[PDB]
Design an enzyme around this catalytic site. Structure first.
Site, short mmCIF file in Angstrom:
data_model
loop_
_atom_site.label_atom_id
_atom_site.label_comp_id
_atom_site.label_asym_id
_atom_site.label_seq_id
_atom_site.Cartn_x
_atom_site.Cartn_y
_atom_site.Cartn_z
N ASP A 184 34.62 63.50 50.54
CA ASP A 184 35.22 63.85 49.26
C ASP A 184 34.89 62.69 48.31
O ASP A 184 34.44 61.62 48.77
CB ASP A 184 36.73 63.90 49.44
CG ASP A 184 37.19 64.81 50.55
OD1 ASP A 184 36.61 65.89 50.79
OD2 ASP A 184 38.24 64.51 51.18
N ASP A 223 32.32 68.39 50.11
CA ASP A 223 33.64 68.83 50.49
C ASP A 223 34.56 68.83 49.24
O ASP A 223 34.29 69.49 48.25
CB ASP A 223 34.18 67.91 51.59
CG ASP A 223 35.23 68.58 52.47
OD1 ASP A 223 35.01 69.74 52.89
OD2 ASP A 223 36.26 67.95 52.75
N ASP A 227 41.38 65.03 47.62
CA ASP A 227 42.12 65.75 48.67
C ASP A 227 43.26 64.87 49.19
O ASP A 227 43.22 63.62 49.10
CB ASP A 227 41.18 66.10 49.84
CG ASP A 227 40.20 67.21 49.49
OD1 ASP A 227 40.35 67.91 48.45
OD2 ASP A 227 39.28 67.41 50.32
N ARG A 279 40.41 76.10 44.92
CA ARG A 279 41.28 74.99 45.36
C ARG A 279 41.60 74.02 44.24
O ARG A 279 41.17 72.87 44.25
CB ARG A 279 40.71 74.23 46.59
CG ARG A 279 40.33 75.20 47.71
CD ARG A 279 39.80 74.48 48.92
NE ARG A 279 39.57 75.39 50.03
CZ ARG A 279 39.20 75.02 51.26
NH1 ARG A 279 38.98 73.73 51.55
NH2 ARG A 279 39.04 75.94 52.21
O1 LIG Z 1 42.01 79.38 53.57
C1 LIG Z 1 41.03 79.05 52.82
O2 LIG Z 1 41.16 78.25 51.85
C2 LIG Z 1 39.64 79.57 53.10
O3 LIG Z 1 38.75 78.94 52.14
C3 LIG Z 1 37.34 79.10 52.31
O4 LIG Z 1 37.19 80.42 52.16
C4 LIG Z 1 37.00 81.00 50.86
C5 LIG Z 1 38.00 82.14 50.67
O5 LIG Z 1 39.36 81.72 50.85
C6 LIG Z 1 37.67 83.31 51.61
O6 LIG Z 1 38.60 84.40 51.45
C7 LIG Z 1 36.24 83.78 51.37
O7 LIG Z 1 36.17 84.35 50.14
C8 LIG Z 1 35.01 85.17 49.90
C9 LIG Z 1 34.37 84.80 48.57
O8 LIG Z 1 33.95 83.42 48.57
C10 LIG Z 1 35.35 85.09 47.44
O9 LIG Z 1 34.70 84.87 46.19
C11 LIG Z 1 35.84 86.55 47.49
O10 LIG Z 1 34.75 87.42 47.13
O11 LIG Z 1 36.32 86.91 48.80
C12 LIG Z 1 35.41 86.66 49.89
C13 LIG Z 1 36.04 87.04 51.21
O12 LIG Z 1 37.18 87.57 51.23
O13 LIG Z 1 35.39 86.81 52.26
O14 LIG Z 1 35.33 82.69 51.57
C14 LIG Z 1 35.58 81.57 50.68
C15 LIG Z 1 34.49 80.53 50.83
O15 LIG Z 1 33.52 80.85 51.56
O16 LIG Z 1 34.58 79.42 50.22
C16 LIG Z 1 36.93 78.72 53.74
O17 LIG Z 1 35.58 79.16 53.94
C17 LIG Z 1 37.81 79.47 54.76
O18 LIG Z 1 37.48 79.04 56.09
C18 LIG Z 1 39.28 79.18 54.53
O19 LIG Z 1 39.49 77.76 54.68
CA LIG Z 2 38.24 66.65 52.27
#
Ligand SMILES: O=C(O)[C@H]1O[C@H](O[C@@H]2[C@H](O)[C@@H](O)[C@@H](O[C@@H]3[C@H](O)[C@@H](O)[C@@H](O)O[C@@H]3C(=O)O)O[C@@H]2C(=O)O)[C@H](O)[C@@H](O)[C@H]1O
Ligand SMILES: [Ca+2]
EC number: 4.2.2.2
Length: 399
Positions: A184, A223, A227, A279
């Site tokens: 970060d 990242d 944070d 976030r």
């Molecule tokens: O709990 C979390 O914060 C989550 O964050 C990342 O995931 C995000 C998002 O929360 C997910 O629902 C997913 O979102 C997808 C697209 O990026 C979003 O624009 C929308 O279209 O919905 C999509 C979906 O429902 O799949 O993925 C996001 C991302 O890839 O950044 C983390 O990846 C995840 O592990 C979790 O921590």
């Molecule tokens: Ca971090």
């Protein structure tokens, strides 16, 4: 007092609780340092346990990806002799590896590679320290400041591009796995009594748009920006400018970290978030006061399209007042994202594209988060937030 000797005001958010945030303001003359490179910065900080009050002025640009002679270090300089991305991709492809954590030769060599870079880019900020940019062009490039200590002030610095050359594949992260990087710009890891003010955070010359996808997932080199995890507490982040970055601010790293309950007391005010994806902040557990922040972006931009501002995580207690979101075409509900365990959001005075909305109500959440902030400065009317924040937030604003 001058910038290096200034302290957090006694009503200025959760950072002002109890002993408050005075950083290195009591430093003797022998403990006022001016640093213009990684060696000088490491020297001024000393050991993670160096509690001597100290003031550190950042002069110009400090690139953290440099060796002991201040020579640039690139991927090949850190790469373990045995690591090869193509071999790593073959080793851990879900079609042959499944969804278990990577292990064995290639993952070991990746971890070694990552640790070589971490040893250059990550530095611990010891207790009773104030670090402030000199003038309007102080920059930390590639670095990750970690704060595990008490009583720290960081101001008037532009942090760019905390970039990890060796992201880890985590096939169980999310619904289809994710690549996760380690750095970060500022990581508050158990740190307490912290003020981050008038800083800028961005991805420098390496925006995420240029990253390939492996296993269908973004090969993510960044990242967070600011944070907070592991019982971090009593923190104010004010007048900062976050821009052109995916995941800005995560407070509370895990649903399983129930010891975060009663901690993560953070106040965010007068911050600017421009072309930030998500976030801003995402919270678990904490009593987080979010007021007078300005969020702006587009859901259709090819780089860093807006997803959500506030992330309502497990047992989060965000109390939001007079925040302004300009994302053309967004619905009231989509201003936030609700996660499992996320049940409550107080928000008042929220404006979305100039319209008064209620984000919490739009998502059917509870209107109360079981507390009301008492430690805060003056709350601007929502109609004045855009102008105040654009004009005042970020590094280079204090001359
Ligand atoms: O709990 C979390 O914060 C989550 O964050 C990342 O995931 C995000 C998002 O929360 C997910 O629902 C997913 O979102 C997808 C697209 O990026 C979003 O624009 C929308 O279209 O919905 C999509 C979906 O429902 O799949 O993925 C996001 C991302 O890839 O950044 C983390 O990846 C995840 O592990 C979790 O921590
Ligand atoms: Ca971090």
């Amino acid at each position: 007092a001058d910038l290096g000797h200034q302290t957090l005001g006694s009503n200025d958010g959760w950072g002002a609780y109890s002993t408050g945030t005075t950083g290195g303001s009591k430093a003797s003359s022998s403990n006022v340092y001016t640093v213009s490179n990684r060696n000088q910065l490491v020297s001024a900080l000393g050991k993670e346990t160096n509690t001597t009050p100290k003031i550190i002025y950042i002069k110009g640009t400090i690139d953290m990806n440099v060796d002991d002679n201040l020579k640039p270090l690139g991927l090949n300089d850190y790469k373990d002799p045995e690591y090869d991305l193509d071999k790593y991709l073959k080793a851990y492809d879900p079609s042959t590896w499944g969804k278990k954590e990577p292990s064995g030769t290639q993952e070991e060599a990746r971890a070694r590679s990552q640790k070589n870079q971490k040893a250059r880019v990550m530095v611990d900020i010891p207790a009773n320290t104030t670090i402030v940019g000199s003038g309007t062009n102080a920059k930390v490039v590639g670095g990750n400041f970690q704060i595990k200590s008490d009583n720290v002030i960081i101001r008037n610095i532009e942090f760019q591009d905390a970039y990890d050359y060796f992201p880890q594949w985590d096939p169980t992260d999310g619904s289809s796995g994710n690549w996760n990087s380690q750095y970060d710009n500022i990581t508050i890891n158990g740190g307490t009594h912290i003020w981050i003010d008038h800083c800028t955070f961005n991805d420098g010359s390496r925006p995420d748009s240029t990253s390939p996808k492996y296993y269908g997932r973004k090969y993510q080199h960044h990242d967070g920006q600011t944070d907070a995890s592991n019982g971090a507490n009593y923190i104010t982040m004010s007048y900062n400018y976050y821009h052109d970055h995916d995941k800005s601010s995560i407070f509370g790293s895990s649903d399983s970290k129930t010891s975060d309950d009663g901690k993560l007391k953070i106040t965010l005010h007068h911050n600017r978030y421009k072309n930030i994806v998500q976030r801003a902040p995402r919270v678990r557990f904490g009593q987080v006061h979010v007021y007078n922040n300005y969020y702006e972006g587009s859901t259709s931009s090819s780089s860093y399209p807006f997803s959500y501002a506030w992330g309502i995580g497990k047992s989060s207690k965000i109390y939001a007042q007079n925040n302004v979101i300009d994302v053309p075409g967004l619905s009231a509900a989509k201003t936030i994202s609700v996660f499992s365990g996320g049940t409550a959001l107080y928000d008042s005075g929220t404006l979305l594209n100039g319209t008064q909305i209620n984000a919490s109500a739009a998502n059917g959440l509870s209107s109360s988060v079981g507390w009301t902030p008492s430690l805060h400065g003056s709350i601007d009317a929502s109609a004045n937030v855009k102008s105040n924040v654009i004009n005042q937030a970020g590094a280079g604003k204090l001359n």
